[PDB]
Design a protein around this ligand. Sequence first.
Ligand SMILES: *[C@@H](O)[C@H](C[C@@H]1CCNC1=O)NC(=O)[C@H](CC(C)C)NC(=O)OC[C@@H]1CCC(=O)N1Cc1ccc2c(c1)OC(F)(F)O2
Ligand SMILES: *[C@@H](O)[C@H](C[C@@H]1CCNC1=O)NC(=O)[C@H](CC(C)C)NC(=O)OC[C@@H]1CCC(=O)N1Cc1ccc2c(c1)OC(F)(F)O2
Lengths: 301, 301
Amino acid sequence: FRKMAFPSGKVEGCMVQVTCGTTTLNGLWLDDVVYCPRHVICTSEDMLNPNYEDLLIRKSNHNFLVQAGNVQLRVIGHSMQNCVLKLKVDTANPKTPKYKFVRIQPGQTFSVLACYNGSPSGVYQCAMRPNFTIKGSFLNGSCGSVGFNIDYDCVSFCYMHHMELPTGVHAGTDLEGNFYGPFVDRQTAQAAGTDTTITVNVLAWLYAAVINGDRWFLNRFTTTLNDFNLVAMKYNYEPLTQDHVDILGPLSAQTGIAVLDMCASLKELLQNGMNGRTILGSALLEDEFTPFDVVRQCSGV
Amino acid sequence: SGFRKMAFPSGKVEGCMVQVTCGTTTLNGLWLDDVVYCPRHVICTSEDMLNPNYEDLLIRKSNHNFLVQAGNVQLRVIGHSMQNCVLKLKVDTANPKTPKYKFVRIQPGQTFSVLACYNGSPSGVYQCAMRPNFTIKGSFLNGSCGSVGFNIDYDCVSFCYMHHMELPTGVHAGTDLEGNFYGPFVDRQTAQAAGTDTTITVNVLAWLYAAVINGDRWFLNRFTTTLNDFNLVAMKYNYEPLTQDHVDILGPLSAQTGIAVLDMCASLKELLQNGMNGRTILGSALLEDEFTPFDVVRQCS
Ligand SMILES: *[C@@H](O)[C@H](C[C@@H]1CCNC1=O)NC(=O)[C@H](CC(C)C)NC(=O)OC[C@@H]1CCC(=O)N1Cc1ccc2c(c1)OC(F)(F)O2
Ligand SMILES: *[C@@H](O)[C@H](C[C@@H]1CCNC1=O)NC(=O)[C@H](CC(C)C)NC(=O)OC[C@@H]1CCC(=O)N1Cc1ccc2c(c1)OC(F)(F)O2
């Protein structure tokens, strides 16, 4: 059972390089518009406390160099929507997929296409943490890399990358330019709120470990939803809602394990530990698979 | 901690996937220039899979018995031949999305990305390591055969794996793109068993180098060993012996850290013989063996 990213080709065809001054990062080119982080317009000194509206009015279209491979695209207009800069260019991207912009919920997963200088570098699956960070792999020059999900042939973009926090986690916006979380695109040290574990996802992953014939963790005990949630919250796990229980049905039916029976198993693991043993390889409980993720990977989408 | 299994962007390979059908048996093929490569067992009915005679099955076949499709568009077959366990179908159209490519045969311990495909359609991409027993731990469902594993160096796709089967323990086996199986497996629907697996020592050493790069270096000792002494001890812990090629591919990390490979070997030996003693490395009490030296450099630097 594998953490699996969406095929990235439809997104690769949209990545371009955007430069302003000595600053270079990635942009996303959809039809005749290039989307990128607005802090591209900032110098070193600008980044410590940037008045973006002020810095933006002092720029011309010709301050922005956009490159699709070897080809420069001419910027014929620019505007700003929250923390994203939109650069209108004179050519349409014929590789534009069917797409939508979505804001994802904490606990949901998406694929990241990490890019440098407009060139795709790697792809991997991430979850929006409850504290609205993401545990990504992003180096200098990764900004403007995007996160996405694919449904049929439609790409739903949900994340654009802007920053790293001192703990090594990452923060960014949706494609409307609104940050996930209480962060700001200024070069200052920013801490996140206390993170919590995505309980419905841990439960999905336990079911997966069962489906792959691993069940040392199961038990005869059982629990009410509320008593589970009391213990969950004590251990900085998110509460489990009835809709979460509903979502887990399919995995429940599949294995013949009632959701609340699996909650009892997870409660025992929280309280006792893994006593050295491991599940699907991991010394640690995994919380970045949604129920959909586990199912779709026992379906074949 | 802070390391992710990261796959290569899959777009260049997505542009090469097709489906190949013989009667009702459909699997995936790889379309490069005017040849489609696929597992030869596409020519087998279930009765043939039980104990197939491939050369006889192939002589009964003509070009017009092979249905090759890119999406729903038929690609006409104008020639067919068998190379080891792969079928080569000459087609009348050169794939306009053919990337720069080569066919490489990887060594155990090397990692690659798998683009899991069904009916010629990509479902997901993920990183795999070739185990020392020549199996991989994939996520492969019915209809996945002919999915390929690859690395991308610059813009050149090195195809190293094509999927053919599952083993009784639920791990996976297949061939290179010349059709030669990795490991002592054959494409027949008979129960086969993989060698007992071992830990990929070269990758563990890469992981220790990664830890040192990130400032986690308690396990470094003042000592060294010969390669032979290390190998004899390591085999007692179900670790793979190192090869000269392993020593060579650790060169860049050795140089980056100034820690000679054989000194790191001595550090590892001490971890094996004395244990971790309740310590963590990179956040874990488990040594990771599915990140190659290349993987470490790509995520550190
Ligand atoms: C893309 O332009 C780039 C992406 C970064 C670079 C390294 N990894 C990334 O993800 N963005 C930025 O550099 C971003 C630009 C601002 C104008 C928004 N700055 C940034 O991340 O600066 C440091 C960061 C801002 C928020 C915060 O708390 N810090 C301070 C900090 C201090 C020490 C750190 C650290 C961040 O990350 C660390 F590496 F772990 O150590
Ligand atoms: C692609 O055509 C397909 C891929 C399979 C489908 C399920 N997972 C896969 O990887 N290949 C085959 O079905 C393949 C075709 C033959 C011509 C090789 N056969 C196959 O995998 O047959 C079963 C397998 C062959 C070697 C072996 O020992 N077996 C028997 C077996 C028994 C019990 C199993 C098992 C395999 O896998 C298990 F799920 F773990 O349980």
